């Protein structure tokens, strides 16, 4: 709620918001192999999780609390990682655009727009790297790229779209972008 | 024009773009008393000035070249220091509103909007501080708040009448730092 805009939390040459780096690195250190990471709610409520996003070393916290604070962070951003301007255009695309490659091309073109601060695309890239690292230990944490897209796309886009052939394409491109990080 | 957006050049807790700080500090060191600062075209063209804004110590350069690079910087920003939405609103209120105090209150309210990165208002504050510093030696450089407003308002707002109210806001904001 008091969480600043992504464009105010950091700037190049930094690669991601410092708070998001702390969360991701703590979660990867403690939960990379956790078979229920991001699929179980912790006991803390939103108010408690937000208190965490202000005050210590995050490794001190329960990994399930960190995972919930990670979700809380994405939800409390004034504008989502993928701005509504971008999602609005992607959803509007006709069925003749059957190509995931085209959807990806358009997301990158739109999100790299000069009207959108570079921090948004940088934050998405950092998150995709995190999701990819998780999917490379799928044999233990059970997370593949598609499930990660289905779990986190509603947090990255923050769009109540009514579910359609368009929404399947957005989930699909996030899936593809996770799997194709390196 | 590869110049990044103001919001991409720095972020809190930094108070202004690092390149703009270097320009301002060099100009104030070398040209605080120059009777023609910011009113003389130097021999350099935009390409040469951009060469300078794209990368060592700026004090090595002719002060009139630094002044031109300062202007070039404001012109090459992808979005102006005062965003188009803000200027548009202030301009459309031009016939109906007259109070300078109201315009100033509104400029601050609009530019502090959550939809606008804080860097824009921070950069404007830094620029106003520079312009005020110049006006304290106006007897020597001839740059008073009014002259500074007429020179730089078109660069801050990015407008080639209605503007007269905008220029007045910058003048007052320079004078009251």
Author numbering:
A (entry chain A): 113 to 167, 172 to 298
B (entry chain B): 113 to 167, 172 to 276, 281 to 297
Provide text from the study:
The N-terminal domains of p85α include an SH3 domain, capable of binding to proline-rich sequences, and a BH (breakpoint cluster region homology) domain. The BH domain can bind to and regulate several GTPases including Rab5, Rac1 and Cdc42. In addition, the p85α BH domain, either alone or together with the SH3 domain, can bind to and positively regulate PTEN activity. The p85α BH domain also exhibits Rab5 GAP activity to stimulate Rab5-mediated GTP hydrolysis required to inactivate Rab5-mediated protein trafficking functions.
To determine if the patient-derived p85α BH domain mutations impacted the overall folded structure of the BH domain, several of these BH domain mutants were crystalized and their structures were determined using X-ray crystallography. X-ray diffraction data collection and structure refinement statistics for bovine p85α (105–319) mutants (E137K, E217K, R262T, E297K) are provided in Supplementary Table S1. Three BH domain mutants, I177N, E217K and E297K, all showed significantly increased Rab5-GAP activity, whereas the E137K mutant had reduced activity. The location of cancer patient-derived p85α BH mutations with significant impacts on Rab5 binding (I177, E217) and/or regulation (E137, I177, E217, E297) are shown in the modeled p85α BH domain: Rab5 complex. These mutation sites are located in regions of the p85α BH domain, well away from the Rab5 binding pocket. Further, crystal structure determinations for several of these mutant BH domains indicated that no major structural alterations were present. No significant differences in protein flexibility were observed for any of the mutant proteins, suggesting that the mutations did not alter the rigidity of the domain.
